[PDB]
Amino acid sequence: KETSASVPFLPKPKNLAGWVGGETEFDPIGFSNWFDMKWLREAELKHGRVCMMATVGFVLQPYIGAYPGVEMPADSLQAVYAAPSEAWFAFIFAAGYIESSSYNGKITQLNMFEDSDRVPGNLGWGSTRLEGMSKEESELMQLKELKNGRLAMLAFSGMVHHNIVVKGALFPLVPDGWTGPEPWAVGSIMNNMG
Amino acid sequence: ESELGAQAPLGFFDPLKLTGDGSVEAFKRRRQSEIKHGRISMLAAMGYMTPEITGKFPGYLSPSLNLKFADVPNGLAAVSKVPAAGWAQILGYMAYCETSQDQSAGTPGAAGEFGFKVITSDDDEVLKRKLASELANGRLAMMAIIGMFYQDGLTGSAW
Amino acid sequence: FESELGAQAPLGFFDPLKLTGDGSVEAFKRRRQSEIKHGRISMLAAMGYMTPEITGKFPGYLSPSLNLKFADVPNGLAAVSKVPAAGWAQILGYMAYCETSQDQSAGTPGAAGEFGFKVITSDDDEVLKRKLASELANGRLAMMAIIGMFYQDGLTGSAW
Amino acid sequence: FENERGVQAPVGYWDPLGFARDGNVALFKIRRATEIKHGRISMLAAMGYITPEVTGKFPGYLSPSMGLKFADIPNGLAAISKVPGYGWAQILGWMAFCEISVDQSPGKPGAAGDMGFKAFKVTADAPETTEKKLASELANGRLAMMAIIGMFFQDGLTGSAW
Ligand code: CLA
Numbered sequence: 001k002e003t004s005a006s007v008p009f010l011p012k013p014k015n016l017a018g019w020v021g022g023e024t025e026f027d028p029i030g031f032s033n034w035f036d037m038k039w040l041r042e043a044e045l046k047h048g049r050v051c052m053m054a055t056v057g058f059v060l061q062p063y064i065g066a067y068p069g070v071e072m073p074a075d076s077l078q079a080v081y082a083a084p085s086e087a088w089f090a091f092i093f094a095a096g097y098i099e100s101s102s103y104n105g106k107i108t109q110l111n112m113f114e115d116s117d118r119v120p121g122n123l124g125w126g127s128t129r130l131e132g133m134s135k136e137e138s139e140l141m142q143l144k145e146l147k148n149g150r151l152a153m154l155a156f157s158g159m160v161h162h163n164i165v166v167k168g169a170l171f172p173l174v175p176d177g178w179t180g181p182e183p184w185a186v187g188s189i190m191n192n193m194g
Numbered sequence: 195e196s197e198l199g200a201q202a203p204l205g206f207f208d209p210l211k212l213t214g215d216g217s218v219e220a221f222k223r224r225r226q227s228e229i230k231h232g233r234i235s236m237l238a239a240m241g242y243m244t245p246e247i248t249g250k251f252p253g254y255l256s257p258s259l260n261l262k263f264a265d266v267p268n269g270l271a272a273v274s275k276v277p278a279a280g281w282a283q284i285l286g287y288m289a290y291c292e293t294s295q296d297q298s299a300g301t302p303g304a305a306g307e308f309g310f311k312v313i314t315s316d317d318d319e320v321l322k323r324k325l326a327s328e329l330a331n332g333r334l335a336m337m338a339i340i341g342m343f344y345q346d347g348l349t350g351s352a353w
Numbered sequence: 354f355e356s357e358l359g360a361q362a363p364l365g366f367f368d369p370l371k372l373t374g375d376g377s378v379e380a381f382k383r384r385r386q387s388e389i390k391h392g393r394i395s396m397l398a399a400m401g402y403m404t405p406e407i408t409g410k411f412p413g414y415l416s417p418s419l420n421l422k423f424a425d426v427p428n429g430l431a432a433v434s435k436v437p438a439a440g441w442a443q444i445l446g447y448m449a450y451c452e453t454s455q456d457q458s459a460g461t462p463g464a465a466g467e468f469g470f471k472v473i474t475s476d477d478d479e480v481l482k483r484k485l486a487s488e489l490a491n492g493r494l495a496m497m498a499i500i501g502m503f504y505q506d507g508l509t510g511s512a513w
Numbered sequence: 514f515e516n517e518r519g520v521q522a523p524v525g526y527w528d529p530l531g532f533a534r535d536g537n538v539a540l541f542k543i544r545r546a547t548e549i550k551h552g553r554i555s556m557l558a559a560m561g562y563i564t565p566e567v568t569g570k571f572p573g574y575l576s577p578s579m580g581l582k583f584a585d586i587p588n589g590l591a592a593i594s595k596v597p598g599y600g601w602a603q604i605l606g607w608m609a610f611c612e613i614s615v616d617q618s619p620g621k622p623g624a625a626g627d628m629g630f631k632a633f634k635v636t637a638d639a640p641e642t643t644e645k646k647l648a649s650e651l652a653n654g655r656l657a658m659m660a661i662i663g664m665f666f667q668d669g670l671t672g673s674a675w
Pocket residue numbers: 354355357358359360361364365366367368370371372381384385386387388391493494496497500
């Protein structure tokens with residue numbers, strides 16, 4: 001019978017039929033059957049957008065210096081420590097306002113896509129560009145956004161954990177005399193001879 | 195098939211014959227190849243001529259690497275000076291320009307029509323003049339660019 | 354547009370470049386509202402820029418808490434930084450009360466300077482028109498006079 | 514898009530690259546609003562460079578506590594550090610208030626340049642005089658945009674204002 005195009009050894013997941021990235025119909029675990037697809041798409045788009053902005057910030061932070069006074073550390077992980085308290089409060093306020101006015105308070109999984117025409121991931125920021133174009137082109141643009149979002153999510157995770165293993169900046173990859181990452185500290189069930 | 199390039203003072207230049215075997219879409223594909231090679235050769239020749247008259251324009255090239263615009267030399271030397279990221283961005287621009295429109299046979303991209311226009315006709319018969327001028331300039335620039343390549347390779351200097 | 358006030362015996366309908374576009378009676382009404390308002394403001398300004406010279410500065414303090422006096426605040430453009438900031442705020446507040454109490458939108462008495470002052474007036478419509486034209490002429494003269502007085506204060510060291 | 518404001522005598526419908534030219538009326542509305550707002554902010558910046566040189570810096574303090582006294586502050590890409598941080602915060606706050614008080618978005622009158630600021634008083638029932646003013650606003654905005662970028666570069670390269 002029907003099988004998923006991406007995973008040929010698994011059934012074709014439903015609820016992915018009419019969607020931007022649904023032609024590859026990749027959903028092995030099957031959160032499609034359990035959760036509202038509108039919420040899943042909104043979460044995927046938001047994660048991708050957040051991680052794309054996060055990736056360009058992580059890359060460009062040690063470059064574009066910082067606020068007059070704070071020392072943007074080469075390793076972007078310590079920028080949270082180097083950030084001023086006022087800057088953090090302004091960032092939190094801006095994020096709260098932006099993410100709470102976007103849904104008119106229906107900002108929860110039970111109430112967000114309950115009104116009617118809440119398009120998943122359409123916050124109205126330049127949606128007019130898609131208002132023109134021709135269906136297939138608009139869906140192609142949305143697919144470009146989705147693929148870049150997934151790529152940047154994985155990439156930002158990789159950047160963070162590279163800075164963790166190297167204990168340094170992102171760009172000087174594999175420093176001289178690397179010989180592999182240091183073995184992980186702290187105990188485990190196998191550390192006490194499990 | 196005597197069109198476009200037939201404007202040449204030589205004429206329908208067919209040494210070693212070629213395109214005599216009714217190769218109409220081979221002719222069109224060679225038109226695409228000639229247009230693309232001409233455009234890239236003209237870009238290259240301009241980017242070789244400009245860095246000597248009004249030389250390397252002041253600035254900076256690589257934040258962490260301390261590479262400036264004045265550090266990178268000209269000619270075939272400059273190949274191994276632009277950092278890996280810089281060459282990556284240049285080749286990515288190449289890839290985006292190539293993949294933006296469909297270049298398959300029959301498409302507007304199968305004749306050099308990518309919507310660049312800019313220096314375009316007013317639809318008053320000067321379209322053929324503009325196309326032929328671009329074709330001739332590219333044809334000349336191809337041999338010019340290969341000659342400059344050989345000069346840099348043998349002499350060693352950018353000239 | 355000759356018969357709508359102004360247009361006094363000196364010269365005629367003075368508009369070297371204005372009102373020649375299309376007439377646009379409502380644009381002329383807006384400009385007349387602005388002219389009457391500017392004329393009243395400039396008449397007050399000229400009177401209050403020449404009076405501290407004809408007559409001594411008011412007997413008092415104008416700021417008992419800050420120990421200022423009407424007599425130790427320099428007359429003219431030097432008074433903007435000397436009159437207390439709260440005093441300027443109150444002056445602007447009275448101006449805002451004048452400008453916001455009665456409506457000044459188009460097609461209203463406020464659009465022709467008709468707020469209800471009524472002190473200098475009459476009942477003979479011809480005399481009403483004569484007094485209105487006199488107000489407009491005095492206002493234009495006061496506009497030019499107060500601008501000249503401001504520039505005399507600025508270019509020179511003080512008033513006059 | 515050849516009948517809108519903009520297109521004029523020196524050059525016609527100017528489009529060397531491929532922007533617009535494919536319908537997309539909403540995209541053109543976005544680009545026109547962007548052009549108008551950029552021209553306005555530019556014109557303001559152009560004046561903010563020319564005036565402190567033609568007349569002179571303002572007669573005041575700008576910081577009675579810190580005593581910056583206006584005139585101490587230089588003019589252009591160097592006041593960014595001299596003007597107090599709270600002063601820049603207040604300037605950006607006024608700009609943000611100008612942005613958020615109106616509701617620039619599809620269809621509503623704030624998306625075509627009408628930001629409620631009804632100064633430069635132009636009357637109703639007299640078009641083709643409002644339109645001339647709007648076209649002049651567009652042209653002066655374009656000229657001022659190029660000019661202000663040139664002034665940025667002049668200050669940066671020459672190391673000081675002009
Ligand atoms: C606030 C200023 C102001 C305004 C709005 C008006 C408005 C008007 N005047 Mg008027 N006027 C003024 C000042 C003003 N006047 C002054 C000061 C004088 C004395 C010279 C006059 C003398 C005058 C006469 C003699 C007549 C009018 C008339 C009119 C009406 C028709 C003309 C018109 O459309 O002009 C519109 C308004 C203007 C064009 C004013 C523009 C001001 C320019 C742009 C700036 C000038 C700057 C200044 C010279 C230098 C200042 C210093 C500088 C370096 C910063 C109209 C209602 C005519 C009338 O009654 O029609 C029925 C008429 O016959 N006026």
